[PDB]
Design a protein around this ligand. Structure first.
Ligand SMILES: COc1ccccc1-c1c2c(nc3[nH]nc(C)c13)CC(C)(C)CC2=O
Length: 339
């Protein structure tokens, strides 16, 4: 059974072309609408299609954002089209697994994902974040379930830009965003003048989860989230609280030292990385490019590095000027001699 529609390509000139697909199958939903998988008739390639109710009182923000983005570690918008009350259909690349699902197979077997995979996956997530943040886009929903994963190639793609937004100095933003477990403390204190650094809090939570086998901060609610954070970081400094929201009763608790938090044969360089990501003071957190340049990811800059299945690594070093624009000298670390 073949559906043909007139769709504009995601990146190109506004040149609507007939597109045909088959094998339609519901795989998802949300308050937005429904998500399908489909096979493109021409290439045979697989696709997800996010179908979203649109009014005419607004440009869709997810769409605006997806048309600007072009990057190996971000899911690609292939086409978009309208259908029957009118819906928007985003046609995305389909990747059958996520970090969350892969990590969960490990965890259900009381096992720990090998560190090489943790390096690969985290590195590519940091790239994707350098890319979007250079446009001033904040994802606002970094979690393992939103990291697409081809486990044979170890390629990771960031997906689900339905909370993503451009942040502008002096335009306030909603404090209750991000999935709870991955939600930065400034957000829990109700900050509305936050930066892109909330995505970096989230990323360190993903890293920490991948080293622990489970979420580091499993909060009963928006507010118990803060308590869970405090058990590990301890109560924040008066200056820390001011850096989060310059404008809540909790007892006084000391920091658990970072080395006691993770399994004992955990590499120092992961702990060191983690600790510069899960900082209270938002401006103390590493930028995504600085995090890519961290020494934890040095195995990935070795010229002989190989996936455990014997294949080569995916592309790790093909940086664009866009991608490097926040700190260009980092290229000396980032692009190693052998490229
Ligand atoms: C907007 O939809 C998504 C949002 C977040 C994560 C994945 C998807 C979607 C899904 C999957 N692969 C995907 N590849 N590409 C897309 C898109 C996508 C496989 C799952 C995890 C089993 C189901 C799913 O929803």
């Amino acid at each position: 059974k073949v559906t043909t529609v007139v769709a504009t390509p995601g990146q190109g000139p506004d040149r609507p072309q007939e597109v045909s697909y088959t094998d339609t199958k519901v795989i998802g939903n949300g308050s937005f609408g429904v998500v399908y998988q489909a096979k493109l008739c021409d290439s045979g390639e697989l696709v997800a299609i996010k179908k979203v109710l649109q009014d005419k009182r607004f440009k869709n923000r997810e769409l605006q954002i997806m048309r600007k983005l072009d990057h190996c570690n971000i899911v690609r918008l292939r086409y978009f089209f309208y259908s029957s009350e009118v819906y928007l259909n985003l046609v995305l690349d389909y990747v059958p697994e996520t970090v969350y699902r892969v990590a969960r197979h490990y965890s259900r077997a009381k096992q720990t994902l090998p560190v090489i995979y943790v390096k690969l996956y985290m590195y590519q997530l940091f790239r994707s974040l350098a890319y979007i943040h250079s446009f001033g886009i904040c994802h606002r929903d970094i979690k393992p379930q939103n990291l697409l994963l081809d486990p044979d190639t170890a390629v990771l793609k960031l997906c689900d830009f339905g909370s993503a937004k451009q942040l502008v100095r002096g335009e306030p933003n909603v404090s209750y965003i991000c999935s709870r477990y991955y939600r930065a403390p400034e957000l829990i204190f109700g900050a509305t003048d936050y930066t892109s650094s909330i995505d970096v809090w989230s990323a360190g939570c993903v890293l920490a989860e991948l080293l622990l086998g489970q979420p580091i901060f499993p909060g009963d609610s928006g507010v118990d989230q803060l308590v869970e954070i405090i058990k590990v970081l301890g109560t924040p400094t008066r200056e820390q609280i001011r850096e989060m929201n310059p404008n809540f009763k909790f007892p006084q608790i000391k920091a658990h030292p970072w080395t006691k938090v993770f399994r004992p044969r955990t590499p120092p360089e992961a702990i060191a990385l983690c600790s510069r990501l899960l900082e209270y003071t938002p401006t103390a957190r590493l930028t995504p490019l600085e995090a890519c340049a961290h020494s934890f990811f040095d195995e990935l800059r070795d010229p002989n590095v190989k996936l455990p299945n014997g294949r080569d690594t995916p592309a790790l070093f093909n940086f664009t000027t866009q991608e490097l624009s926040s700190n260009p000298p980092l290229a000396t670390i980032l692009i190693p001699p052998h490229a």
